[PDB]
Structures are given as C-alpha cells and as structure tokens.
From a paper:
AGT is a hepatocyte-specific PLP dependent enzyme, belonging to the Fold Type I family, catalysing the transamination reaction between L-alanine and glyoxylate to produce glycine and pyruvate, thus leading to the removal of glyoxylate. AGT normally localises in the peroxisomes and failure of its detoxification role leads to increased levels of oxalate, coming from oxidation of glyoxylate, causing calcium oxalate precipitation in the kidney and urinary tract. Many pathogenic variants of AGT cause PH1 (primary hyperoxaluria type I), a rare autosomal recessive disorder. Our results shows that two forces generated by the salt bridge between the conserved aspartate residue and the pyridine N1 atom, and by the Schiff base linkage act as opposite springs and are responsible for the fine tilting adjustments of the pyridine plane of PLP.
D183N is a pathogenic variant of AGT that causes Primary Hyperoxaluria Type I (PH1), a severe disorder of glyoxylate metabolism. Although the mutation is conservative, the variant shows a 2.3 × 104 fold reduction of the catalytic efficiency, whereas the affinity for PLP is almost unchanged. By coupling this result with the crystal structure at different pH of the AGT pathogenic variant D183N, bearing the mutation of the conserved aspartate, and with a molecular dynamic simulation of the transaldimination step, we propose a novel interpretation of the conserved aspartate role. While the wild type enzyme at pH > 7.5 shows spectral changes, which can be interpreted as deprotonation of the internal aldimine, in the mutant the internal aldimine is protonated over a wide range of pH values (5.0–9.2). This effect is also a consequence of the strain relaxation, which increases the stability of the protonated species. The strain release of the D183N mutant is also likely responsible for the slight increase in thermal stability observed for this variant, and for its apparent resistance towards radiation damage, given that the internal aldimine of the mutant seems not to undergo x-ray induced-reduction both at acidic and alkaline pH.
Residue numbers in the entry:
A (entry chain A), B (entry chain A): 5 to 23, 25 to 389
The structure:
Amino acid sequence: KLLVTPPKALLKPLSIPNQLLGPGPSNLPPRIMAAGGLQMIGSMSKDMYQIMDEIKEGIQYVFQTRNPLTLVISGSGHCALEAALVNVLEPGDSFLVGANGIWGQRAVDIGERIGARVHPMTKDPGGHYTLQEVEEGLAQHKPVLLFLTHGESSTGVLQPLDGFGELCHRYKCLLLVNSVASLGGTPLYMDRQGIDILYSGSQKALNAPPGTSLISFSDKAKKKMYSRKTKPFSFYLDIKWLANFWGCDDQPRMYHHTIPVISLYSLRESLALIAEQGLENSWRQHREAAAYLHGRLQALGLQLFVKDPALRLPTVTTVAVPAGYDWRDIVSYVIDHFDIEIMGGLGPSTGKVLRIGLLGCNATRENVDRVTEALRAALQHCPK
Amino acid sequence: KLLVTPPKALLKPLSIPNQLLGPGPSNLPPRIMAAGGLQMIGSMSKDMYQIMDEIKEGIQYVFQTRNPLTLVISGSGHCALEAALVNVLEPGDSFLVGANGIWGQRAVDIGERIGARVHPMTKDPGGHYTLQEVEEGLAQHKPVLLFLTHGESSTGVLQPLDGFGELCHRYKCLLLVNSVASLGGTPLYMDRQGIDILYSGSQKALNAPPGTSLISFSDKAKKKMYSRKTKPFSFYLDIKWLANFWGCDDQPRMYHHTIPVISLYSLRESLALIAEQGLENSWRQHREAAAYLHGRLQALGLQLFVKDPALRLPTVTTVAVPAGYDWRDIVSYVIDHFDIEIMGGLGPSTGKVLRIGLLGCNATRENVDRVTEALRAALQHCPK
Ligand SMILES: *Cc1c(COP(=O)(O)O)cnc(C)c1O
Ligand SMILES: *Cc1c(COP(=O)(O)O)cnc(C)c1O
C-alpha cells in the first residue's frame, strides 16, 4: 500500500485572486494570457524554430542591436545574469561591479561563487556611478568585465549609460548592463552605447509571465566566450550549446535542453505588442506616467527617495517611508483594502522605502490614480 | 533615429499548428491550458505561497515521500539535475554515474564541469545496471553520490530500482535518481526505495508545459548539502536559498528569485489531475497502453529495441530502424502526412532507433492506433 495519499487541497479546483503595481511582475494583457493558454507544439519543430527566430528579431528590436548572438535564456533574471557571468568569466578574472543596491550585490555573490576577482564599487542606496568613479576602478583593478545596473529597481535610480561602453573599451574591458527593470520604459541602445552584454527579464515592462529572459552579446564578448580555455561551470547555461540551438552559429540545431514552449508563445506576443507600439512611444508613455505619479505622491505629502528627477527610474519609483509609520502596515493596508500590490525596500533599501511600479500596459495615469487613493487611505488609517 | 525597426514577422498575429507522441513534451489537457491562460498574482503573496504549499504536497504524493526538503526548480530537467549536483558535490568528491544513454552522459559533463571525481559505468544503448555492476563501482571508486536514470528515454529502458538505495547506504553513498521520463507512468517510491535525491520534469507524463521541475531531498542529502564548506557554484540554484523561499526551513520566506507564476498554476493543475486519478491507476493505464503498442508494432513487422519486456519503459518505446530505410524519412513522413510527432534516437542511440511516447492523458489505445497507421503508411511510401 502507498503511504502518501492524494492531497486534500489539490482535489479542490484552483482559483486565484484578482490583484499589481510593485517592482514586478506585472499584470498580463489579454493577448499574452491568450498565448499562455495555447496547445503545445513540437519543441524542435520547423514551427518552433520560426517562433524562436521571430523572438530573436524582437530582442534585436527592443535592445537596438544586430548582434547575431542574441537569444532567450530559459530562466529568470538571475538566470540570465549567471549565464553571462559563467560564460564570460574564467576563474580569477577581474570583475568590476556597481554595488549601489541589491542587483550589484547579487552580481557580487555570483562572481565570488564562480571564483572571479571581485571588486565592488560600493555606494549607498540612492547613489549612481559617474564616469570618473568608473575610470578610477578600471584603472586601479583593470577588470575584464564591468557590471552596471541600468534600472536599479531596489533604489528607484536610473543609471546614466552614454559613454561608459567606450570608457570600458579604452581599458580593454567588457560592459555588461542589467536592463531587466529599464528595458521598454526608458531609452536604451545596445550598439549605439557600446554595451557588450545586455540582458532583461520577460516580467517587467514587457508584461510577460516571469521565467524567461533576454540576452545579447557583442562580438568582443562572443570572442572572449568562444576562446575560453576552461569549460563554464554550468551545462544548462553553456553559451556554445545555446547559440547553436537558437540558430546563431553555422551548424544544424542540436538538442540541448527543452525550451519552455508556452512561455515562448507569451514572450513572442509581448514582443509583438511593443514592436507594434514602438519603443519611443513606450518610453514616452512611461516618462509621462512617472511624472504624473511623482506629482500626486508629493501631493499626499510624501518625499521621493531620489531627489534629482533626471536620476529617477520611470518604471519603479522609490518613496521615503513617512516618519512615524510602519512600512509593513501601509503595504498591508493597500493590498488588504484595495486589492493592490506595492512593495517595501529590498537589500540595502530594506525598510527605508516604498516601491511603486509602472510597467508596460500597466503604466497608466489611471493606475497612478488608483494607487494614489490607496496610499491616501493607508496614511489616514495605518497607526502613527 | 533608431536603426533597428519593428520586425515585419512580429506584426502578424501568432498562430501555431495542431500536432505529440514522441519522448516529450506531451500535449496539454484543457485544464492545464486553462491554468496557463490565467492572470498574474503577487509572486510573494499569501495566495502564491498557498499554491506553492499545495504543489509541495503534490510532489510528496507523486514521489511517495514525506521529505520536508521538497520543492520546485524554476527550470527544465537539466536544471533540476545541475541543481542536485551543484548543491551535493564539493569539487573532487567521488561521483558514480550510470552511463547507459544520453542522460548519464549529461550527468557526466555536468559532474566534470563542477570539478567532481567522475567515474562513468559505461554501457551500450539498451543496457541497464545490476546490483553487482553497482557494488563493483561502489567498491572500486567509493563515491559520495551515485546517479541512475530510471526511465531511460534515449534507449527505452526501465531501470530496476529496488534495493540499490540500501546498496548505496552500506557504502555510505547517496542515491540520485532521474525520473523525468518515468514519474507517473511506472512504479516509483522514493522513501520505500531509499532514494536520496529524486527529480522529475513537468513536461512528460504530468502533461504540463516544459520549464519546471520537481525535486526532493532525504535528510542524509539535506545534511550533506547544509554542512558543505564551499559555497555551490550557482546562486540561482543554491538550495539553502530555495528551501527558505519554498517554506521548507524555519525562517520567514526571503526573496531569492522570481518563480514562474503562470507555470506554477499549470504545474499545480497537472498534479491535481494525477492526484485525482491516483498513481496506481496511472501506472496501470501506462502499462496496458505500452503492451497494446508493442503488439501493434510487431504486427507492422518491426523489431522492438529492448528485447526483454520487463526492461521496457512504458512511457517511451524504442523500435529498431527497419533495415533499408532512412529513419529521417520515416519521422518526416509521419509528421508531414499525419500531423504526428515521433522522434529518432538521441546520444548513443542516434540513428539506431525510433522513439514513441505515451505520456499522461496522451497514453491511450486510441493514440497508439493513430501512430500505428501513420507508421504503416511511412513503411509503404518512404524509399527503400
Ligand atoms: C525584477 C528585476 C530583477 C529580478 O529578476 P528575477 O526574475 O527575480 O530573477 C533583477 N534586476 C532588476 C533590475 C529587476 O528589475
Ligand atoms: C525529457 C527527459 C529529460 C530532458 O529534460 P529537459 O527538459 O530537456 O531539461 C531528461 N531525462 C529524462 C529521463 C527525460 O525523459
């Protein structure tokens, strides 16, 4: 006899609330939900390949690149990061990291884990990196790779990018940029800013379900990875394998792992939506919304964490915890009474901030309202 | 001006054929497709946690275990493998591997990559492992971990399991079993067979979309992993992190990575279906079908790769390439003329075999027919 019996809770039907305006993930639009409900096809079929090919073109379009080594990572944001680090870095190599919030911190941990030379340019939450703080580190530590967070979703900071690609190439270094938060909602041009490795997530402004990520590599990166003398520590993430499967190199596509088919359908659609909308219209939408939101938020009497408006990330706003409140009470209130998700801090910003998120189709004046009135109420009833 | 323009192909609407009876993935039933079409919820919400908790109970039920360290890996079959290896093996450690087809071979590559002592018990395609070939290796190489493929989908072989858990524990070793193919479609009892690490995939007999996997750890494994002195090479796959998030350990759930929400909805449902159906009824269904199929296949005049019926994997049948044919012609024919996917070999079995798959709700007499008549036709028209 079987000792473990059919779980009582599973024999009920699944049902989910109706809720998201935090740092992510974001709500899905009809078209993407529709894609997610479709039947499976052969995971190595002519049809599946065509879908992948369209996804690649879409990643080129949203990154603004023509890099032939552009493909989807079967896994979340951290997965894409770990993939870029584990294929570009042979143990010991020098690694320069912009540690201005949790997303540098994580790149640190990953770098350390794979045995790299880890030099963390540490900076309080709110801070960003000047060309000179960059040169200072490029000079003192002479790294083969630098990591910068573009949209720092844990501190609400937009990192300036122009010119750093070039600063890296003078010091022979490679530029890796995390655009999970920013991609789709602020200007970003891979080739025109000399970024070597650019990655993003499906779940932020693209409004896809979490679990896929986008990645692209320049030919300087492609060269470093293909002329490695060690094998990378992960098979799942071995780029030479992935590239082949994704049609990037010359050979016929050889099975590696099984791609998340139904998530790909979703991703494709999220790309078609933003391809139809167009990037500059997207960046406008996000910019305007962020401004509207900032205005209403100061109207409630709150103080924005990032003082300088040019340094604010449109997709994710940080707001200082108003004195005399418990941030958890406010957050609780908003979901408990209005069915709306916002978030507190994260990593360094923990307990310092509240975070509010405008991502893709969910970055509207309408939603800003809803969240404004939710915060009003919480400020009236959450104990002071 | 933006140099990369909106991709022409994306601005058309997505559409997919209607097709799957290969080694996997498998077709989805309505209920799972429905789940895949649902809206997002907060990825760290009380509701999301409850769903995860039900998924855990379901993994306990299908593995037959009460191991509190049981959870879902955000990633495919290889991801789950790499996760078990990267958390259980400190560099150098001795690693005994059942290399009887591609799935041992991959565990080899992964083991080598993370710097383990890799001893591959190599065996031609079709072969399985006796308790004595196991003891011989346990004795000569004295490993801390042994890997066995349960359902060898690349050779159609069901590996016997009874007693090997115990053989391992006498040599102090840990038993890791790959049940991606077999889980749901043949008998398997984690605790009653003394397996230390058991993993499976969402996409085989559970009929979920590819991109999630199941994993469970015994307390001997849990102890080895938690008392490591090196950190594991992957952050994404660090078990101490995952365990916490998945509610396994004592602490409140701390954000690690973002779980594939919508895939989880799907997984939950695939588990509820088999929980309602019950395992022994599932194993019956699969067993019967496999027998029906074997009969019809010899009727067409074909010769089954695995001679001994007790060693045949119900979920995946291997059939010898009939002399004078091009296996690619046959496979092509079947999809091209009937909208049915089957597969050729893989790894060692490449070009030797054809593979036919009966997985979950798609393991029916009905589908066996359809594929039988497809093969008939291909044998009449595919050039000899
Ligand atoms: C959301 C986000 C991440 C997290 O990605 P996961 O899906 O949690 O792996 C990382 N970096 C940035 C900038 C983000 O906005
Ligand atoms: C399908 C299958 C795999 C492959 O899993 P991926 O999703 O390709 O990572 C591995 N092992 C076995 C036994 C299988 O049946």
